[PDB]
């Protein structure tokens, strides 16, 4: 809890010193993190003395509350939250059968509390555009889980639901929640951000190829969580622009202008101005990685002289599994980029006559 | 309640929404029928009605103190800015007549666009009263707030101001 | 019910209180009274005139209207 | 204290009116009920507290003409959004004559993110104004989150519409009319006989909005200055600044 | 059946087509639970 | 999965299995002309029962 506050600031400084053209990189107010209610998670009859089938109705009521993260009268969410593994405490004096079924139903609650915490802590600006959309598309599935538990509340109001029927109804969303929570655990544990949290979403999507109950989940999550990175890459390949407000994109722009600003002795535009990062490559694109840097680096230096450069057709790019069509799209952009710059330099800035007159 | 209020928001205060000089249309009673806290909602809403009586008084006395033809033109404009606030109180009653469950909060929502036009026109009117801006300087106090920044009251004061120019383009068209 | 405003006098009954007799005319009839008054007509049961001063009748009540607001609007028509 | 009472009370915290059995007993902290049910109540009432921030800020800042042309429109947009939040709230009232979807945990969820984001915007824009406030708004459209980026980037269109109106008037129209420091240019009156053009108009440096380059600010100053001298003596913008401003520059200069 | 699927899913070394088998082995266990739900529903069924 | 491996192993050309599943098992450390003669082996343990040897010799 307290230990995250450091990590956020330590990341923020790197982006601040990296990028000075874009100033006052945003932050959320302190209470956005301090207030505990904004995040998802935070007269009692003695249960011993009742009949059994009323204990069932009681525990079912408490569990229908637990599914949304809010505590129950007979079952409590333990407040430790050490490491990341949420734990729950059922009342000690219950029927052994019901207690064990409550334990077998409980993992979706531990896999909801961590899932919401991931969405709050990794939706601050500092963690980067990709880690934002991962939480922002995990958040839709959180909403749909809430839809489901609302329908279960209606059925329970009509006295027509039991713990055994609950067990069946929560199976499809138990798999959803387990995939989301393990994926969030891995993303947070690896401190992965940018394309490191676009590689992990590719590898976990290979991990389940025939399941197709979790594969559609992961393919949808990566479709939604790769809209940020690909929008950076889509601009990078078809335009010289690197917004990349935070140091997330694989390509980076070093400020070597401070040294090289007349003769540009360093040949910095093609030596060390636009350089590559190793750990922030998506790793479905390592095959094309160098070509992308070349691709957009060729676009910058015609975007620099004011001659408007635009691709004939800008094709939007979406994450895909089993089918490397992004590869041919990068090549289709690369060859036009090479024509773009070589032609621009050979008609504007027309290099042959310069070389002759040198 | 939902007709007493859809008339108290208009000129006619009623017993529930007692009028007073120091403060206007503050219902102050413990009622079993209304929910305990609905008075607070009603207080926030009665700010709008109170303002409406204040403009209506101001248009009444015009059209030693303040006088002129411009106070006979600004008030005519202040009728027109309030016309969509009358029609929008008719429509509320038309809906409430049929729907029997609809509550006060729809009145709140529907008459929430009129909690930006009114409060920032009220400062214009109190300026015109506290400072005796009687003559041609009325155009100044309208054009100085017409720059604004809040679009509801930037177009409201524009409707007000154009009428004053309508007077000034006949005073300075008879002259020229 | 919101069509029976001030028909319930529970607020008044919170203290001991005597209710006053009132005619209980219909709201629709009130517009008819106003319309003939706004045209040339005298001796209407609403808007009783006394010395050439048309004045709202002292006791008129309606279902979905309280006495005071009804008095206020009716006086405002009677001024015209 | 049955749950039916809590539903009827909680349907007013969202408006921000203290309920019967729910109140802002501690003035700064959120509403506290006077068990599992209680714990549901707080998460639902945080919308009311965020509403208190947004509303209480746009009542007061809307009556303050010192805040400026930019900032009064910011409060405008905040209030137009609170309007749409009240459209939902009215429907909830009508649906009371069950309506406990975990007590609205589903209904409120979508407004709750649209409330967190604006409650963050007002206090990232606290102290700032003009181009600086528009800069803060442009700062908050740097989240991958599509729903939040969509909300903020309509707020920015309204908020920076005055800013770009100054820009598209101080270029095209000829004159600059800001009474407060609402723009990145700072005219100074002086005699200005033969020293006219050198010093009347100067680039202020606190009010250039963050989605503009210093070169762009300097060049727009030169345009506005040319077009005003001509009368008195003679995605930043979807990357449309660099196309429009330079065209105006070329024409204005050669024409001056 | 459920001990096997509870241990296999906890090991990526189990195999990719293996995991396809262990997720096909759950489709035929959910319907078993559905039948159990019906069995419970008719209890107030011998 | 085994008829998707064999459907991207054929029409497009790909052998992606971090685990020992598909019947072909390519050998790395071959960037030379020896891809044809080495680098591919029909592992005779992972050949599925519903195809015979002559069927799988063609597939490799």
Short mmCIF file of C-alpha atoms in Angstrom, two decimals, chain C residues 14-42:
data_model
loop_
_atom_site.label_atom_id
_atom_site.label_comp_id
_atom_site.label_asym_id
_atom_site.label_seq_id
_atom_site.Cartn_x
_atom_site.Cartn_y
_atom_site.Cartn_z
CA UNK C 14 -50.07 18.38 14.36
CA UNK C 15 -51.39 21.15 16.63
CA UNK C 16 -55.04 21.21 17.61
CA UNK C 17 -56.79 23.15 14.86
CA UNK C 18 -60.27 23.84 13.46
CA UNK C 19 -60.71 23.45 9.67
CA UNK C 20 -62.48 26.26 7.82
CA UNK C 21 -65.32 25.56 5.40
CA UNK C 22 -64.39 26.19 1.76
CA UNK C 23 -66.41 25.73 -1.42
CA UNK C 24 -64.11 23.19 -3.16
CA UNK C 25 -64.65 24.43 -6.72
CA UNK C 26 -63.01 22.52 -9.55
CA UNK C 27 -59.84 23.86 -11.15
CA UNK C 28 -61.46 23.57 -14.58
CA UNK C 29 -64.37 25.75 -13.41
CA UNK C 30 -61.85 28.35 -12.25
CA UNK C 31 -60.58 28.94 -15.81
CA UNK C 32 -64.16 29.34 -17.01
CA UNK C 33 -64.71 31.94 -14.26
CA UNK C 34 -61.53 33.78 -15.25
CA UNK C 35 -62.52 33.74 -18.91
CA UNK C 36 -65.95 35.27 -18.43
CA UNK C 37 -64.41 37.83 -16.07
CA UNK C 38 -61.79 38.79 -18.66
CA UNK C 39 -64.70 39.26 -21.04
CA UNK C 40 -67.45 41.69 -20.06
CA UNK C 41 -69.41 40.00 -17.25
CA UNK C 42 -70.45 40.83 -13.66
#
